[PDB]
């Protein structure tokens, strides 16, 4: 190739769920004495499922807290925002908002749209939005000013083009590419991440991933309150009817069949909300892993961090989840060229040190592998091995040596 | 009418025909706040998702979370040691204290546009 | 659980199977049969998915130990917090303990740096490491510890002219061939 665009795409992934509690005795059978008491004949039937219950509710903030809480301090970016023509100001905190949430990350928690019954209540998460959003700025100032230094020890400062000069060198570009094309390549980084807020605002279903499980937790409540008023064999379906109308002696009949089936019905919720615990648990540690390794780090994992050759990535916060950017590398224009294994010359094999050599039709040269870069060929860019008769399939040239015209 | 379960939400008044609304009394769980029978004998009680308005009687603090009782609200913020709910953490200075946790020490690194520490 | 009545006379079966008669026991058997039941399906149900999470968690520890004792893993945090060198695992009731070995840099300080150097109307990148002053003086150095060395045409080399990029500083590089020539 002899060109190259930046590119950034966007991943979403779920993290939490909300915490719900449910009341046993008082969803099964409340304000009545003639009823508690044939339910305390069943053993703990109400007190498993309120641990599991517990259980859950405790582990979302475990969730949360491992995937956001990365970080030791808390960084801050400079006063000036002279980063040698990058343009970050989409995704920085906006310092004239009555909360300090980057254009984007506020976009995303307006495009997401999320009562009272009997026995079930609701629970605030440990962590508010406030401080969710302080975490991942001051993730993003770190890896804005110090690179990934911060990671590992303590925090050293670098200028942002030479850290950019590093992690082109880190996919096999060397570094003068970046020192000659730094306008255009900053050009290119505004213009793509400038296209992330129309394509998310104007796509719809783009966040779906964060709206099922709203979804689904709000049918599963709904499902279970709407099941109150079923009969399931009795005369009525309500309490007070059948206890203020008959004889303890009889009711007690009708009153079993109401508690029976409850009971079942709420060991159906339990058991549902269990294995979707376990999804979403699976989810936040992907979550985890990923933060960790692409954001602190440059990953050369195929496809983990990006369609691409992975260059950095900048995190943005989502109610019940977390959105990734990932800035990737991408050759774009390619050319058709003749090759050869080694050169003989002087009856001795030559091969290239780093790179393969090409030839444009008459004359022989050697180039780096992602981008074209011809250069003469000589005695400091290849070693020799061996004879000629060995290696299948190669032709003949001279190799220069720099010795010679500045001994002469 | 009648909710969307079998319970009614109004009903009309005999006598005067007159309507009048629903709504179900509070209710809520309780949970105490203990430093640890090795340290003390006191604790603090919450009266989760209901206002301090109605009712172990020592003092009131409201929270997003519910009535606060027996402990005193502080402005200094110190790392979180009892986790209580919306941001609100809570033994020091013999007293059970309530405060705001706090995400770290504030740092920030010299950048400049040619200087790098090695 | 055993214990419970579930609605019958007796949670003992024995005592309503010899007291009551034939027709009436048959009834009151079915109520302890249906919790005992629902008892033993609840349990296995638990520890099903226990047991998916264990396995989980195995699957975890066989991949920590694959990547981390039998190699040097580059991946994040994942065999610990720093830069890895080396693991070793220690055994443990139901689990394993890993000992990570990791390194850390300290001490640090403060220099300025140029991104190349002009010299001959020829601009120099560094091979490896980067470029520092302490003040007077401009040397070469690594970038996980600080060691200067003299700028000399074998750890640099040149591409192109002055003119092209931004923060180009003037200096003198030398060649090992001068003192030989001299
Ligand atoms: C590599 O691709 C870039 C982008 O396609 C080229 O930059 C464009 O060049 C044309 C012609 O000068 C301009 O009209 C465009 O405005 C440029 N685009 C941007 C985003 O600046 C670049 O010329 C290509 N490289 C080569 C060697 O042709
Ligand atoms: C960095 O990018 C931001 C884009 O967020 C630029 O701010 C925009 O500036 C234009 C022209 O003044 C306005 O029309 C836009 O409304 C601004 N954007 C927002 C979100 O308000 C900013 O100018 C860029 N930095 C520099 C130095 O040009
Ligand atoms: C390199 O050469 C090959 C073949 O000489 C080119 O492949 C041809 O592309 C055209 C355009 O689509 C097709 O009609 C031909 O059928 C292709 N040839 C074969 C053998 O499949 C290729 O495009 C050249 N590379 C570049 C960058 O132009
Ligand atoms: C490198 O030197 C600069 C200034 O010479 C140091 O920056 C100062 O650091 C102190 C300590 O926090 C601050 O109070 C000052 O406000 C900083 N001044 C400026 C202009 O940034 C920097 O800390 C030094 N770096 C190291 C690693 O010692
Ligand atoms: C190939 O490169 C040589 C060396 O610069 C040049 O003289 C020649 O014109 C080139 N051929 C083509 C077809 O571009
Ligand atoms: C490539 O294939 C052609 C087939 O025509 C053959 O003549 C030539 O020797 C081959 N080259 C090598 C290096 O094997
Ligand atoms: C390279 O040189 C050898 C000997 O000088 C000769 O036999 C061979 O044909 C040459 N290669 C080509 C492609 O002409
Ligand atoms: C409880 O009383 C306080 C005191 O004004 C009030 O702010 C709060 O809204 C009340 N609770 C509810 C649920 O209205
Ligand atoms: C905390 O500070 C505010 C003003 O900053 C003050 O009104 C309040 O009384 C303080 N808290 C206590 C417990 O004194
Ligand atoms: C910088 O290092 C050189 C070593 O060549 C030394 O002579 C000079 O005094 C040093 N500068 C300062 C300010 O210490
Ligand atoms: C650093 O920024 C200053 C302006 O604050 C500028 O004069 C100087 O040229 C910049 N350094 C480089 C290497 O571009
Ligand atoms: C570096 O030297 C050249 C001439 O060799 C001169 O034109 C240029 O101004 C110098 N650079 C600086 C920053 O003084």
């Given at each position: 190739p002899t060109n190259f665009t930046i590119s950034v795409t966007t991943e979403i992934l779920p993290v939490s769920?909300?915490?719900?509690?449910?009341?046993?005795?008082?969803?099964?059978?409340?304000?009545?004495?003639?009823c508690s008491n044939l339910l305390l004949q069943?053993?703990?039937?109400?007190?498993?499922?309120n641990r599991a219950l517990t259980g859950i509710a405790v582990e979302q903030d475990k969730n949360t807290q491992e995937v956001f809480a990365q970080v030791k301090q808390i960084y801050k970016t400079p006063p000036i925002k002279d980063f040698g023509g990058f343009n970050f100001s989409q995704i920085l905190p906006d310092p004239s908002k009555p909360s300090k949430r980057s254009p984007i990350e506020d976009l995303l928690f307006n495009k997401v749209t999320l009562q009272k019954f009997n026995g079930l209540t609701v629970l605030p998460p440990l962590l508010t939005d406030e401080m969710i959003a302080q975490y991942t700025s001051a993730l993003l100032a770190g890896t804005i000013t110090s690179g990934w230094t911060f990671g590992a020890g303590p925090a050293l400062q670098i200028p942002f083009p030479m850290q950019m000069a590093y992690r082109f060198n880190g996919i096999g570009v060397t570094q003068n590419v970046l020192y000659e094309n730094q306008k255009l390549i900053a050009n290119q980084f505004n213009s793509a991440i400038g296209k992330i807020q129309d394509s998310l605002s104007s796509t719809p279903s783009a966040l779906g991933?964060?709206?099922?499980?709203?979804?689904?937790?709000?049918?599963?409540?709904?499902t279970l309150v709407k099941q109150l008023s079923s009969n399931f064999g009795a005369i009525?379906?309500?309490?007070?009817?059948?206890?203020?109308?008959?004889?303890?002696?009889?009711?007690?009949?009708?009153?079993?069949?109401?508690?029976?089936?409850?009971?079942?019905?709420?060991?159906?919720?339990?058991t549902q909300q269990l294995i979707r615990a376990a999804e979403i648990r699976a989810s936040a540690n992907l979550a985890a892993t990923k933060m960790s390794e692409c954001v602190l780090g440059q990953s050369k994992r195929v496809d983990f961090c990006g369609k691409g050759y992975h260059l950095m990535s900048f995190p943005q916060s989502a109610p019940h989840g977390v959105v990734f950017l990932h800035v990737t590398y991408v050759p774009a224009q390619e050319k058709n060229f003749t090759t050869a294994p080694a050169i003989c010359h002087d009856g001795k094999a030559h091969f290239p040190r780093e790179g393969v050599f090409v030839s444009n039709g008459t004359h022989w040269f050697v180039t780096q592998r992602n981008f074209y870069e011809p250069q003469i060929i000589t005695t400091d860019n290849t070693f020799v091995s061996g004879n000629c008769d060995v290696v299948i399939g190669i032709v003949n040239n001279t190799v220069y040596d720099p010795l010679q015209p500045e001994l002469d | 009418g009648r909710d969307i379960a079998d319970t009614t939400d109004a009903v009309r008044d005999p006598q005067t025909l007159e309507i009048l609304d629903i709504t179900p009394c509070s209710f809520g769980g309780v949970s105490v706040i203990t430093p640890g029978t090795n340290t003390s004998n006191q604790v603090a009680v919450l009266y989760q998702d209901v206002n301090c308005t109605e009712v172990t009687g020592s003092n009131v603090f409201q929270?997003?979370?519910g009535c606060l009782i027996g402990a005193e609200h502080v402005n200094n913020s110190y790392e979180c040691d009892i986790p209580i709910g919306a941001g609100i953490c809570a033994v020091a200075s013999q007293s059970i204290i309530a405060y705001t946790m706090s995400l770290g020490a504030e740092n920030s690194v010299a950048y400049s546009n040619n200087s790098i520490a090695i």
């Open positions: 769920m909300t915490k719900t509690s449910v009341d046993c005795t008082m969803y099964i059978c409340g304000d009545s004495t003639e069943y053993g703990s039937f109400c007190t498993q499922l991933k964060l709206q099922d499980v709203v979804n689904q937790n709000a049918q599963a409540l709904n009525s379906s309500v309490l007070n009817d059948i206890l203020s109308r008959l004889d303890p002696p009889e009711a007690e009949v009708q009153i079993d069949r109401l508690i029976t089936g409850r009971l079942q019905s709420l060991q159906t919720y339990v | 929270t997003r979370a």
